[PDB]
Amino acid sequence: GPAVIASIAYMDPGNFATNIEGGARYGYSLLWVILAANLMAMVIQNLSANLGIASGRNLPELIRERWPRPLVWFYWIQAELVAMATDLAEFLGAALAIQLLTGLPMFWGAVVTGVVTFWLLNLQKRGTRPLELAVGAFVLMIGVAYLVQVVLARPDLAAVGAGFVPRLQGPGSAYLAVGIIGATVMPHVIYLHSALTQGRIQTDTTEEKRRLVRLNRVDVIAAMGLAGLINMSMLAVAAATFHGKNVENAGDLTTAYQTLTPLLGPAASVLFAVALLASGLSSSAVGTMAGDVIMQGFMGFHIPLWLRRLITMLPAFIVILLGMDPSSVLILSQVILCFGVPFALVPLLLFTARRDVMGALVTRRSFTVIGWVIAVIIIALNGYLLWELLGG
Template sequence: MREASVRPASVVATGATATDASAPPNSGAPGALEQLLAKGRLRATLSMLGPAFIASIAYVDPGNFATNMQGGAAYGYLLLWVVLAANLMAMLIQYLSAKLGIATDRSLPELVRERYPRAVTRAMWVQAEVMAMSTDIAEFLGAALGLNLLFGVPMLPAGLITGVIAFAILGLQMRGHRGFELAVTALLGIVFAGFLFETLRIGPSVHESLRGLLPGFNGAGSLYLAVGIIGATVMPHVIYLHSELTKGRVPCSDDAERRQVLRFERLDVIIALGLAGLANMAMLAVAAKLFHTPALSGLNTIQQAHQELGHLVGGTAALAFAVALLASGTSSSSVGTYAGQVVMAGFINIRIPVSLRRALTMSPAIAVLAAGLNPTSALVLSQVVLSFGIPLALVPLVTLTSRRDVMGVHVNHRLTTVLAWTCAIVITALNGFLIYQQFATS
């Protein structure tokens, strides 16, 4: 029997859990949110930050390194506007996912299972698993490259070591969400600090950066990379994950308390996604400054970018790049595995051991490493594949958050719905045009 069939309609509409509904009124005991706010505004805010930081690590994963480096080398600052637009879309999308979890105490996959036909739910699960594997290709290859660049570890053993590190980080999540959040946030800080250092050291052109914020393309190649940048920035698996991270995080007794939690979550999204967006823009601007030359415009591997950083700027810059890549790959790999658990449990109500899921999702990346394929090309291709999964996650997200019987008083405003559908249409249109260009030029 489906969970929705035994859940009171009034509970679904307001997002209150059965526990909330049965709590004795006016018991006098302070609620969880009230206790949190009693600690002071600053401590309460810091305690509430976290879910968006988990999601944001996926927005600076190794796929971003590959697409941003290639985009800057081939087209200079031209695609900087794509990075900015993708990040703004990500902020809206991740907030909607977080809001869904807070308002309904359900994750997006759970609500799809409850409210959509079984055939649709299973199809959604299958495509979400494909997206998870595409994600793992980028994350594993990036972390393996980081180990290879830092310590000279061969690529295949480096990939296996990455799996072990991911298990260790996931072990923190099994002991409670806060340790996992702090570990991932620390790794995000390493990535951000690395590219802040690169930007200050190299000094990209401010004038050219501002020009790069004006929309435009330069042929099919720039469109291919633009779609890859969007695929590397707006990640389907964290659209599903964010709602899981926020549901029931702070038990709320009524809609007024949910509004307070939503205000904290908006701040969480703005800070976390803002840092991720700045890191991405710094990546592309650094690549544009250093590599957009006749000799280096064809740069197409992360190893080459690392080597040229060392030649052009110095060993410290190359070291910062490699450390940031390793931090990005290991943390995003752990988040990807966690998202895979959420997807399977939500869509088909089946849970498997995390070790088995880790082995399944890492297998395509290990196969790429074993075959000796170009890791950076595989990274970019994986990001293009990911971009095709974005509309499939966005459509139910926007639909459900626009329904008053699901969200109650927290239903989307009309403008929010219009903006969200615009994001979905733009991404879908870019993907369709990319397919047309590929067939037209083949």
């Protein structure tokens, strides 16, 4: 359940934008970022899931009930900015895929995306589970296509091997590496994963809590391992397809279908846009629902779901009216998301290390140290990037 609701967020249009642009512009040199961020997500999402299992509350709820009111207010504001940056990539990714399929302008693609998302808001298991199993099938099959294409493309193994050595090539590579981290370590899922596993116990016992931790850990790592293989394959295929060939608009999502042309042939254009649309519509609905859970946990109240859906569409329509490139703003949103990670990490690392919160399920001291090292690494990368974007 939670590991699957997770996995669909790790294959949103934000991942497509950063993987294709990462491989086309920098070859295989950013393969280590995908591997590092995926292993970071395994640790962080396991802690978030263990927080809801052990304590019975989600991370926003614990912040609201334990921290001072002004700090809860600041944490709610930054979490809403994370929610809008999350939905900005997924809503535009669906509107872009509409243009790839029908040829409509981006504004009309967003109007269609707006009507669909409002319609998708009103639903239930009688209608969601088919639509959710469908979007899961299209996105996973395309993921398998990249797993197959990465072998058929015959990538330069000397360049692939060197790509797993941590190496940054100027500020442009740091900008895209931070976007890859934000697209994999998503703060909105950090808050959401605790709510997905709360209230799932059956006998209210430590032994029952330990099992759900053991079960969730296997489901998360297996799902994260599959998502990591696909993202590495998609970047490696994008490198074998565009890197060094000096193709115009290489790395853009409008020509990303050419990565699967030697495999899918003429159908690569439709099958990629259908996957991009299904990935965008499902994740944008999931993010909207998680945004209401985050607000309810921080503030105790919420705004109507139609108003939240209306407010988050404003940055999408503004970007389209400005004529900005969709693939560029999808990557920018993932970069902003990476700046929301350390804010989500600090309460997670603190709450999961307390006995009055976790009970007998206190996080092992080694994994708490590993989590703080992950927080310092991300803070250093986000400070290094900010340093490059200001001046010397």
